[PDB]
Design a protein around this ligand. Structure first.
Ligand SMILES: NCCCC[C@H](NS(N)(=O)=O)C(=O)O
Ligand SMILES: [Zn+2]
Ligand SMILES: [Zn+2]
Ligand SMILES: [Zn+2]
Ligand SMILES: [Zn+2]
Ligand SMILES: [Zn+2]
Length: 305
């Protein structure tokens, strides 16, 4: 039984991706962009009213297994699109002019493991040579300043970069999709938790992006829009500056592919519950995040390239 106000297991999310597509065929199409290490299908939802030469925004959730609110947000975004299309001016304009490539759960194997064995699991579930230690951090596995300071060469570590850039089938599947659709993808959004942050490149090195002033002003405004609903306080800025060095990230990789608007959203909370954010907070977290996402979406539409 699926619920947008509850954390759903992979079996439930998978059945939901099929159901939401069948219930809304004129607004959603579903494809498998590859398979995980354990052979699970990596589903991707193309959300929007079909049309020729449409620009797109890519958004992923569940890169890190324990960040259950991120998986919940991708489902809420799709919920919003199907419920408010034709009922709300902005969402109607967004789905007519843009397509949203929503990847609800990238690290499916890790997510299954948080539900079955270890709630605090972060990485993939792939094996490593010369150790019984499992998994690679997908957010340290992209080919952008890969395995430098901020990523670990130790397979037993939470920030393990992997054997090579894109060693993970999940990472390769995401990277291959973006590369195959580079001409249409105008924005990249990666949903994570926690610490209430809106981060933009760079994280692989201490350097500011070409459009730093633009990204700083956009993140500032997105943070402001999010705060209007419940007064939730978000901080923002370049990754290495506001957070820490985190090389091999999807956001930095997407940015270096030419995707000018690249953001990582760290959702609720600030540490009280951490990754174990209660279900009672899903609605509030998702609704306020919607305001920041819609603001970024509206900006991208007014600044197409
Ligand atoms: N691509 C830069 C994103 C950095 C933040 C992210 N934070 S988290 N969700 O706590 O793991 C991470 O360390 O991968
Ligand atoms: Zn308006
Ligand atoms: Zn994360
Ligand atoms: Zn910070
Ligand atoms: Zn709503
Ligand atoms: Zn402008």
């Amino acid at each position: 039984g699926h619920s947008y106000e509850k954390y759903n297991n992979w079996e439930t999310i998978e059945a939901w991706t099929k159901q939401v597509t069948s219930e809304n065929p004129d607004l959603i199409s579903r494809t498998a962009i590859g398979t995980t290490f354990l052979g699970n299908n990596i589903y991707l939802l193309k959300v929007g009213k079909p049309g020729p030469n449409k620009p797109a925004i890519f958004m992923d959730c569940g890169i890190h297994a324990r960040e259950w609110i991120s998986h919940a947000f991708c489902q809420w975004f799709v919920r919003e699109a199907v419920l408010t299309y034709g009922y709300e001016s902005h969402m109607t304009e967004f789905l007519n002019k843009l397509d949203f490539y929503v990847l609800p759960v990238l690290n499916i194997d890790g997510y299954i493991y948080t539900w079955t064995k270890n709630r605090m699991w972060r990485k993939t579930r792939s094996t490593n040579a010369g150790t019984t230690c499992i998994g690679t951090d997908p957010n340290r596995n992209f080919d952008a300043g890969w395995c430098t300071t901020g990523a670990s060469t130790d397979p037993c570590d939470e920030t393990y970069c992997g054997s090579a850039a894109e060693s993970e089938k999940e990472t390769k599947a995401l990277a291959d999709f973006i590369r195959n659709n580079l001409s249409s993808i105008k924005a990249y959004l990666s949903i994570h938790s926690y610490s209430q942050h809106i981060v933009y490149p760079y994280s692989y090195d201490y350097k500011l992006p070409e459009n730093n002033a633009e990204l700083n002003n956009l993140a500032k405004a997105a943070v402001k829009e999010l705060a209007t609903l419940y007064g939730t306080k978000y901080t923002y800025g370049p990754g290495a500056t506001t957070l820490y060095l985190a090389p091999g990230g999807g956001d930095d990789w997407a940015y270096d592919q030419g995707i000018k608007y690249s953001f990582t959203f760290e959702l609720r909370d600030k540490g009280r519950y951490g990754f174990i954010l209660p279900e009672s907070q899903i609605q509030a977290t998702c609704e306020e995040t919607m305001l920041a996402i819609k603001y970024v979406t509206n900006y991208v539409l007014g600044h197409l390239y």
